[PDB]
RNA sequence: GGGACGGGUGAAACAGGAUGAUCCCGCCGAGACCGCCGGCCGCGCAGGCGCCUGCCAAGACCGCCUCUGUCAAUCAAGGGCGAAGGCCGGGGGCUAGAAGGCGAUCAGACACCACCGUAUUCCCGGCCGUAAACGGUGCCGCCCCGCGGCCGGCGCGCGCGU
């Protein structure tokens, strides 16, 4: 019943993959495909996981998701599609005796993208506290949730995809979160767990052209 | 192979792929894909290199399969890989088998450069009921 | 007679507690009676860490860990030497 | 996409595979569930209670030179609630899984182990009214060696620290 078949890799060719301008390194790699008999459409939509540190040679525990939207000059162009953290960091985040807060909210954009962002916070220990457990009461918790929502709305209420990607590459949103919260109590780790794209417009050409070859833009 | 049938050579970077390891309690899989998982360059399993069913997850078969994979992928022009080490998961053991370390070493000494490493075991925030009943495997 | 003051569990100021499943036999156990141990370990064991670092390309790359919680039933903990059967006087010691 | 085994066990064998399986990625559908934090923490008359957001009523405690003036304790009969399983009538139909079937093991094995799988497990309305329903210790009330931990509220002192 078994049959031999010709080697597939005698009819293959590679294509390069490029990232937006926000990052110093933009060559993601190469992708093989099978000869048209059409390569352009089949490789039109593919998602590549990229570690942030490799994009910007702190940055070793975050990775982005990038999807191709256009193939031109035999090279593929990509834009933002999602951001997440590594699993080992998340596992490390947890410690007994502390309280955990996870919040998610939906945020629209000027471009029509709608995003859901996940935020995680933990409490810490006071410097000269007699007790060893670092739990807190309820009013404190509701205050922290309200502060998270308010700060996220203010610093991301209105934004564009390039601005959002620049902010994620930096950590100013996390910095604002921690400074807003720290005025309440001792928080331990505060940051963004991940970002998802809920719905996007069908056609994204001006945005790719903006994201790619932005240079000074 | 013709030059077009291989990754383009450029000194700026090196031909980077991704390797998926399935370190189960009954079998081991070593799988190579591009940056995305939509294609495949080399797929091998420990059940090809042994005749005894219980030895399929044994590390020796893992090493043999791994070096065969190294030969094929080096023929196809791939030198550096990323590691995605995975267990069965899904209301299961959640601990690796004994073929994983063998695969890692065999890649390392096969002249294969190493990049990043992450855990890819499927884990839930919930749980469907697992088999065995409320008394468990009584043996 | 009564063997332990705690009745073999940690149940205070309650009537019922949520349940879990043993990781090796999949038995159902109350959460306050199951035996728990937290472990932290390297994905690559310690003998090949140097080779992994030499073969790695990133500078300063840190080896990621594994964070897991293991839960075992009474029968399986004993069979795997997780706990020992102790003497009558030594049952009252509570240090690790 | 790729090309030969995969599954499972102490070891195996039944079921899956050139109709391309296992493996990688993406998308779609439905229904369950609420993890690591999670505890000699807590809430509730008990049985029991853990996703986001919002709504409705309730409750013990603490603090008080606020009101009434014995209005209380316990209880046959009577009334209400009451785990899981089970039943009646409608919905829904993914996991697991009584019954049933099949492969091993055995002297035998219709059991323990492997696999397939019906009722059931989920929702609504209504019956049943039982548990190692255990702190195997009835409710109200007074005195009582000493040390220590945690939870909530209040007050005091200072060099202002949870
Ligand atoms: C008399 C029935 C037992 C003997 N058989 C067949 C032979 C055999 C061989 C094994 O490897 C040496 C083995 O693994 C321990 C099991 C068996 C079975 C097992 C039968 C008994 C069974 N129930 C009681 C005790 C027991 C203990 C076991 O050790 C965990 C076991 O392995 C799963 C099976 C059993
Ligand atoms: Mg036994
Ligand atoms: Mg006895
Ligand atoms: Mg009880
Ligand atoms: Mg019922
Ligand atoms: Mg009684
Ligand atoms: Zn177990």
Tab-separated table of C-alpha atoms in Angstrom, chain C residues 17-63:
chain	number	residue	atom	x	y	z
C	17	UNK	CA	-14.412	22.421	51.137
C	18	UNK	CA	-13.730	22.186	47.427
C	19	UNK	CA	-12.114	19.051	46.041
C	20	UNK	CA	-9.144	18.237	43.813
C	21	UNK	CA	-7.718	15.240	41.959
C	22	UNK	CA	-4.538	13.314	42.720
C	23	UNK	CA	-1.944	13.686	39.988
C	24	UNK	CA	-0.854	10.024	39.830
C	25	UNK	CA	-4.055	8.030	40.475
C	26	UNK	CA	-6.675	10.734	39.751
C	27	UNK	CA	-8.532	10.090	42.999
C	28	UNK	CA	-10.838	12.788	44.352
C	29	UNK	CA	-9.610	14.298	47.621
C	30	UNK	CA	-10.712	17.237	49.794
C	31	UNK	CA	-8.491	20.270	49.371
C	32	UNK	CA	-7.652	20.392	53.090
C	33	UNK	CA	-6.558	16.732	53.271
C	34	UNK	CA	-4.354	16.453	50.176
C	35	UNK	CA	-0.561	16.652	50.395
C	36	UNK	CA	1.034	19.577	48.561
C	37	UNK	CA	4.603	20.388	47.533
C	38	UNK	CA	5.866	23.313	45.455
C	39	UNK	CA	8.915	22.787	43.253
C	40	UNK	CA	11.100	25.015	41.090
C	41	UNK	CA	13.474	23.431	38.593
C	42	UNK	CA	15.262	24.031	35.314
C	43	UNK	CA	13.836	22.820	32.015
C	44	UNK	CA	17.285	21.593	31.006
C	45	UNK	CA	18.865	19.679	33.861
C	46	UNK	CA	22.067	20.873	35.474
C	47	UNK	CA	24.621	18.731	33.614
C	48	UNK	CA	23.926	20.175	30.139
C	49	UNK	CA	23.283	23.792	31.156
C	50	UNK	CA	26.817	24.844	30.218
C	51	UNK	CA	26.525	23.240	26.780
C	52	UNK	CA	23.149	24.920	26.295
C	53	UNK	CA	24.635	28.305	27.185
C	54	UNK	CA	27.616	27.834	24.869
C	55	UNK	CA	25.343	26.811	21.989
C	56	UNK	CA	22.980	29.718	22.675
C	57	UNK	CA	23.382	32.938	20.701
C	58	UNK	CA	21.727	35.588	22.866
C	59	UNK	CA	24.046	37.352	25.315
C	60	UNK	CA	23.066	37.025	28.959
C	61	UNK	CA	20.295	34.553	28.154
C	62	UNK	CA	18.820	33.213	31.390
C	63	UNK	CA	17.671	29.605	31.646
